[PDB]
Design a protein around this ligand. Structure first.
Ligand SMILES: OC[C@H]1O[C@@H]2O[C@H]3[C@H](O)[C@@H](O)[C@@H](O[C@H]4[C@H](O)[C@@H](O)[C@@H](O[C@H]5[C@H](O)[C@@H](O)[C@@H](O[C@H]6[C@H](O)[C@@H](O)[C@@H](O[C@H]7[C@H](O)[C@@H](O)[C@@H](O[C@H]8[C@H](O)[C@@H](O)[C@@H](O[C@H]1[C@H](O)[C@H]2O)O[C@@H]8CO)O[C@@H]7CO)O[C@@H]6CO)O[C@@H]5CO)O[C@@H]4CO)O[C@@H]3CO
Ligand SMILES: [Cl-]
Ligand SMILES: [Cl-]
Ligand SMILES: [Cl-]
Length: 378
């Protein structure tokens, strides 16, 4: 292949807390190929779950490349904080990674970030307290041991509405007026949250990990970002499983999680002379080798197709549970509508109000109607 212009510059990379050490190793691999791109790796101010805020507060001071959860991408694209990937970069992402990873980064048919990990929550449990059979159903698990969780976190519990048969922004998460939780099915989910307050096997906590460490919890729901810490806390007792079934409408139905795609995006407001270097870095740190280094350190699940089939990943307990949860019917891809910030801000008090009893059952249909109106604005 004929000579291409040398890639050079100086770029800053934002990653989540605890991820810097192994991204520095990935950057060392990057610099074997691109020695003239100087990279500084730091944590971001508030993490990938807060990227649109961290970047938007001052785009020209934000990192050139930053970690960002896929739900934020439509808002950031519409605001002009991230540009479409090039045709060649898009083609490579789409060929190399699982289909849902490409869907996760695509807004209006164009890709806006470089996906690298698949996130779906699972049950982590102490297998000296609960067996694999015990964790198959929510009522059966919670009758036997304490599950510690947070009903103020809508990422944990909104997917019960999806188990109930409602849609979030319509059939593929792209329909502004497509959330239909203002229905009898939505009321079923509200009642399920409310049931948990008096379930002595369910503990509300802001820090489920601490309850696992203290032994107060037999099980938690969590994502693969915390898997290394959970393995160390639980030791010989570590076990993981997909979410259980729950009882809604007289049936047993799989309890869903969200399916999130973790990504890196290029800041369109970072220094112009460094934009080529930034895109080159984003492509490299999300390549197959880099995804497998992330897996080796944190246990997060690659989106690269070959990595998912590889012996190490296919046989890993956490990866197996996460990949099962990623299947249709077990999870729903987080939508990326620009309305998502409003959705998150309004969904948490809706769910927590049902759980705590602050919202009585006589108000469920009213509160669901107001919620749909509030999250469906153009
Ligand atoms: O200690 C935790 C955290 O606390 C502080 O964050 C708060 C923040 O300041 C508030 O503004 C608010 O955040 C809201 C947020 O701005 C909204 O965008 C929205 O968020 C939704 C996300 O957009 C959506 O993607 C999803 O988020 C889930 C992620 O997709 C998923 O990956 C996972 O996230 C975990 C990370 O993967 C993991 O690396 C690890 O991250 C650590 C951070 O890197 C580190 O900065 C710190 O985070 C602080 C933060 O700095 C404070 O400002 O510690 C993290 C580990 O403790 O862990 C992540 C999980 O914590 O899971 C998230 C879901 O939890 O859904 C969210 C909606 O739930 O709404 C937000 C809430 O209104 O609140 C946060 C939290 O109090
Ligand atoms: Cl159940
Ligand atoms: Cl149940
Ligand atoms: Cl509301």
């Amino acid at each position: 292949g004929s000579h291409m212009k040398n890639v050079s510059g100086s770029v800053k990379l934002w990653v989540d807390t605890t991820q810097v050490p192994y991204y520095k190793k990935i950057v060392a691999n990057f610099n074997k190929k691109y020695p003239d791109v100087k990279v500084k790796v730091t944590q971001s101010p508030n993490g990938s779950a807060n990227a649109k805020t961290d970047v938007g507060k001052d785009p020209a001071k934000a990192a050139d490349v930053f970690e960002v959860a896929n739900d934020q991408l439509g808002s950031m694209a519409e605001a002009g904080y991230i540009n479409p990937l090039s045709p060649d970069a898009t083609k490579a992402v789409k060929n190399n990674n699982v289909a849902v990873a490409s869907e996760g980064v695509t807004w209006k048919g164009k890709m806006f970030a470089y996906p690298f990990a698949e996130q779906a929550q699972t049950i982590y449990y102490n297998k000296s307290k609960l067996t694999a059979d015990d964790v198959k159903t929510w009522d059966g698990l919670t009758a036997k041991g304490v599950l510690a969780t947070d009903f103020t976190n809508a990422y944990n519990f909104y997917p019960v509405f999806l188990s109930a048969g409602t849609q979030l922004y319509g059939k593929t998460g792209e329909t502004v007026k497509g959330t239909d939780v203002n229905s009898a099915k939505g009321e079923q989910a509200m009642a399920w949250f409310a049931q948990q307050k008096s379930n002595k096997g369910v503990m509300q906590t802001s820090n489920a990990l601490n309850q696992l460490k203290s032994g107060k919890a037999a099980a938690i729901l969590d994502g693969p970002w915390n898997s290394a810490n959970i393995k160390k806390i639980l030791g010989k007792n570590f076990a993981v499983a997909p979410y259980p079934t729950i009882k809604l409408d007289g049936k047993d139905v799989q309890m869903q999680a969200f399916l999130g795609i973790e990504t890196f995006a290029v800041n369109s407001h970072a220094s112009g002379s460094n934009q080529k270097a930034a895109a080159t870095l984003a492509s490299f740190i999300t390549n197959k080798e880099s995804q497998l280094i992330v897996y080796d350190h944190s246990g997060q699940i690659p989106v690269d197709k070959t990595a998912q089939k590889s012996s190490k990943v296919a046989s890993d307990p956490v990866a197996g549970a996460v990949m099962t949860m990623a299947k249709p019917g077990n999870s729903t891809l987080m939508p990326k509508m620009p309305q998502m910030a409003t959705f998150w801000n309004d969904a948490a008090p809706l769910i927590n109000g049902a759980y705590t009893g602050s919202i009585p059952a006589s108000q469920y249909s009213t509160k669901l109607d107001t919620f749909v109106k509030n999250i469906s604005k153009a």
